[PDB]
């Protein structure tokens, strides 16, 4: 089944869409906006969901 | 001032907020902000014809609620 | 390739481009025919131009083969209907659909590339005698596309 | 703002699997294909289908 | 998944079962089309029934998705071609192949379970009037599978 | 009397020593001896149809050098 | 922080948890009260335990301050109701909602860490005489949480 | 049979299990679906941590019960 | 009762039926019997997810890494 | 990949039956004897012949 | 670096990838990986003498393509 | 016993060992004869030692009885040719073959156990004067093994 929750707002700010993909290795957890995710990476926090370190934040478009 | 629509490469339709005096270069900048596509890979088509960068929407008689068609930059050869 | 091709056919039934139509020839889903209407305010105005489409077995990673079957006067299309156009080869993208390819080809009719031409004689006329270019293209439109 | 309603639509290449293969280039990513299809493009050294930027990596994208 | 899928396809090329065929249409190995001939001496005899097969990316650890595209009258298969069969869900085995799955479905055609059906109306008729059941399934085979 | 063949689950083919009067359940117990598969997990198929436990090979027109097809126990529902 | 807290409150109302309950004390959305049901099959069984919650202004980037207001016998919870627990400190996650924090705290009751205790005397007892530990913990539950 | 797991964000997923599934079997299936390593998973039912080494039948966990996923934690 | 010859496992050199690549060294044990048709890597994946034996559906007691001296 | 061509040869003890008696110890096994011969070893409390670990069990081993 | 051969207990010959500075104990570890034999029950013989876990292959002037011989740990008495 | 012994003989024919040779004494497959080359860099260098081998009825569950018939000087072999060696008694293994047994015996020559000896006199001389032992062994080798 398909990602119906991807339409829901960022779980952190509950305001902006989920367009800040949190990347680690070849996998990523997409559940937050670019602003909130960039904050985590700026402060060297790990991924909120899997606790892996954050390799990068990718601004994610759905073309 | 007016709304127009762009049918993007995947078939998804987006809405832009434009002026008649907006250049095509300007429109592509807005598509870049919404979709993450550099303007030089954008080719806009209206009534079967491509829209040149330095000409305005109104130079092509593109009015409120028109639909532009986005394809990929191409080169006859 | 099949389910992608069926989706493209559904989109052509529901919301096709203004100048462009296409569908399977018979029951062969990998062999289509297409039409492009000559754009208004252009030497092709009032002509209808037929094309042949063959989808390769690993469409859409590989581009369709696209050729005119209607003769047409243009610097990047020759007498056999072969179209020299980068999105049909090295600049193909798998996000392009037949609908988008046809619209693209439609935009090429009005915006030729005479600087890297498939038919050099027609390109010279296009660059230096646009009155005669428009005239001959109009004549070919009446002779072959009406 | 506008939320991505087209995210539940299938991969635009195979028209079957979910959109979970994010195509990364620089700081942006285009998510319109499944991981299997996007990976095939990366292995064949193809650019991004929608913007033609070189593909940096394909990210298997989860939606927690 | 691909290598396993390629081995199954080669097997079908060299030694298919009598009743069943399947393969990809293009180069897309994850999407197959299949056919099952209605078994002799059944309501389905003389019919050819098309199915669609989608392999998940962790095949063969997870089952293929299999659905009829030809309409068939049967208590465990509904008007969308959905097949309520345990080896397609909780009783899948990685040792099953598409060949064995098609053969299993084929054996389900003449051994339905009306006591726990997908289509209640058809199970009632199967239990309370076998002749009418055979009449109808025969008419459906003639109408849709020929 | 005669040999038959059984295409097992993995595609491997085995040879069985049978009388035409042997029951289907007899054949399954032979498959268990050869392959370690419990008879209640064996579904044998011939001419597109499963073979019932209390019938004989002759009850199914199974001749010598016939091939039976072994799949897993299944339940429609 | 406000929008995220409001979201959590509405989620709690739309979908109340089985093991805990929580909401604002009156008007201040940053100060909440909560209740934890003691785990069945434990010394805390049948007890109901109250807690206070203060959200910092950069919640959920920073953890909420969470303390018991009902006395409870545990090596990692002291007479101030303070809870020494890594997810409230350095192992916090912005994806933890207050419902998840409360369920996590509840699971800590039967999963104490006596080797790094907040109340050494309770932990020594836990490590040397377990039946003596359970006896007392049941006593405190009946004295203070019923 | 099927059970539910309410994951960290509140999203609910479905798992295919047997009564003999151990809790580590369950965490492995959660990782398959959600890409969360098992050693940062903590599963809770009826207010108690479920322990690696014990099975769903050991905990009498019912078909279509819901297990609650939080993050690995430690008191101190 | 006729004389029965021993028969030897010629299919033992075929690759794992799951990955079609690696040798059959992952033995699936249940009771006092084993079904050896997958590599250790593929069989451990079944065991780690408590899936049954693929050919007989008995529960997988243990996977044995099998050497052939 | 080195495939076990020697799995097809007879039991190294009786040289007559196939190698269907796996000698199990922990999570590894040595397969070189038939079931009958390997049970004799287990019955007599002998260790594994090639590695000298104790014999946990003999598993009758099929190649399906 | 180089490769060598080990004749195992049944006579089956196997191949290892080693460096001339590898310890005897290091070779036995690679033998344990391929054959499941604990090193403390391995006895490697070369030129009729036992090889001791401290030395290396160069110590014993063991060139590439040499065959080492494996028996079981033994002790006179 | 017989088939296994046969097998060991064929394998000897296929891959002849370099430190030793062995085969049946004429007609009796259960009575064998063997020779060992004395190791280089050792006091047995250049010697050829003969051994007698007898297989019991339940070979290979029980070890062969192996004794030297060439006199030799060594703490773990006595004047009757008896070899006190653990693999020939309690540490036997059915995977051992005559070839492996002989090579094992050859490596015992340069790896004696003086601390639990068969011949104490030779043992004491091995511990206290290594130089004497090698002189004597070389002499015994020259006297008896050429
Ligand atoms: Zn946000
Ligand atoms: Zn993550
Ligand atoms: Zn795809
Ligand atoms: Zn892109
Ligand atoms: Zn495998
Ligand atoms: Zn099995
Ligand atoms: Zn044997
Ligand atoms: Zn062993």
Residue numbers in the entry:
A (entry chain G): 429 to 491
B (entry chain L), F (entry chain C), K (entry chain F): 0 to 76
C (entry chain K), E (entry chain B), G (entry chain H), L (entry chain E): 2 to 147
D (entry chain J), J (entry chain D): 428 to 491
H (entry chain I): 1 to 76
I (entry chain A): 423 to 491
Original authors' sentences:
The most prominent regulator of p53 is the Ub ligase (E3) MDM2, which binds to the transactivation domain of p53 through its N-terminal p53-binding domain, thereby inhibiting p53’s transcriptional activity. Furthermore, MDM2 catalyzes ubiquitination of p53, where monoubiquitination promotes nuclear export of p53 and polyubiquitination leads to proteasomal degradation. ATM phosphorylates MDM2 on six residues (S386, S395, S407, T419, S425, and S429) that are close to the C-terminal RING domain and far from the domains associated with p53 binding. Here, we show that S429 phosphorylation selectively enhances MDM2 homodimer E3 activity, but has no effect on MDM2-MDMX heterodimer E3 activity.
To assess whether cat MDM2 is also regulated by S429 phosphorylation, we generated cat MDM2-422–C-S429E and performed autoubiquitination assays and UbcH5B–Ub binding analyses. We showed that the S429E substitution enhanced the activity and UbcH5B–Ub binding affinity compared to WT, suggesting that the pS429-mediated activity enhancement is conserved. To further validate these interactions, we also determined the crystal structure of cat MDM2-422–C-S429E bound to UbcH5B–Ub. In this structure, the interactions of the sidechain of S429E in MDM2 resemble those of the pS429 phosphate moiety in the MDM2-pS429-UbcH5B–Ub complex: the carboxylate moiety of the S429E sidechain in MDM2 forms a hydrogen bond with the K33 sidechain of Ub and coordinates a water molecule that forms a hydrogen bond with the backbone amide of Ub’s T14. In both structures, crystal packing is facilitated by residues that precede the RING domain and that are unique to cat MDM2. Our structures and biochemical data suggest that the location of pS429 or S429E with respect to the RING domain is important for optimal hydrogen bond formation with Ub’s K33.
